[PDB]
């Protein structure tokens, strides 16, 4: 029952940017992760930034360096700040929402020496 | 309801590798990511692999080259290949499962020369 509401496309020359916002509305109290997706022509749709309730990110290589995600918790809203555009750019970009559950007992990794 | 169990972890010799691993059961239908998570002592808790039911991964900076997430989808098991082990990689590592949600309608980027 979450919706999800991307705004901020359009045309954008190369070397410019574009900034995406991605609203959140709908019962989200469980939502813990955010994604930005893009489905370039032709190809499968990717993952290009996430971001978790920590403030903790990732990117996708292609993007990583030039794309920016962040987050307003208080009014549930994820931006994505894209820089250095190319042609490789175009796409139509997608907002996803997750709900990340709970972890195992862990398992203790040592290393020597 | 779903119930994750890891195994792998014990004393690696520095450079050497480590497989470890991540046993779901219970209803995981709609689970359709997953992810790793190491705890060095002292620190957060932090993102370092995860992967989706696409088979698309991502990896934090610390551990992207050395570090492989594959996954088991017929026996619900999440690996975690790890290589060039240093006593940087000292920690508990945790499995995380996740359910990602519907897409918004997206948004066209179309970027000209
Ligand atoms: C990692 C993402 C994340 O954890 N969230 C998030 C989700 C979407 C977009 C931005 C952030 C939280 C979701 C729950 N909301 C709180 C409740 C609420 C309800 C109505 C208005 C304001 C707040 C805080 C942020
Ligand atoms: C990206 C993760 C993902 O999509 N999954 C997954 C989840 C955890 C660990 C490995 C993979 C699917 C979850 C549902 N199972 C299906 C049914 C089933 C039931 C009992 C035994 C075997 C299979 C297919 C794999």
């Known amino acids: 029952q979450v919706q999800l509401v991307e705004s901020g496309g359009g045309l954008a020359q190369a070397g410019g940017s574009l900034q995406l916002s991605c609203a959140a509305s709908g019962s989200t109290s469980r939502v813990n992760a955010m994604g930005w997706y893009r489905q370039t022509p032709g190809k499968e749709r990717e993952l290009?930034?996430?971001?978790?309730?920590?403030?903790?990110?990732?990117?996708?290589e292609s993007v990583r360096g030039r794309f920016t995600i962040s987050k307003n918790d208080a009014k549930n809203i994820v931006w994505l700040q894209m820089n250095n555009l190319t042609t490789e750019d175009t796409a139509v970009?997608?907002?996803?929402?997750?709900?990340?559950?709970?972890?195992?007992?862990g398992t203790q990794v040592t290393v020597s020496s | 309801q779903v119930q994750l169990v890891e195994s792998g972890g014990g004393l690696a010799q520095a450079g050497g590798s480590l497989q470890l691993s991540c046993a779901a059961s219970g209803s995981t239908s709609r689970v359709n990511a997953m992810g790793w998570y190491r705890q060095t002592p002292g620190k957060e808790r932090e993102l370092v692999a995860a992967?989706?039911?696409?088979?698309?991964?991502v990896y934090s900076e610390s551990v992207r080259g050395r570090f492989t997430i594959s996954k088991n989808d017929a026996k619900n098991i999440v690996w975690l290949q790890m290589n060039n082990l240093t006593t940087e990689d000292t920690a508990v590592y945790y499995c995380?499962?996740?359910?990602?949600?519907?897409w918004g309608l997206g948004t066209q980027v179309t970027v000209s020369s």
């Open positions: 995380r499962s996740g359910v990602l949600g519907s």
């Open positions: 992967i989706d039911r696409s088979g698309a991964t």
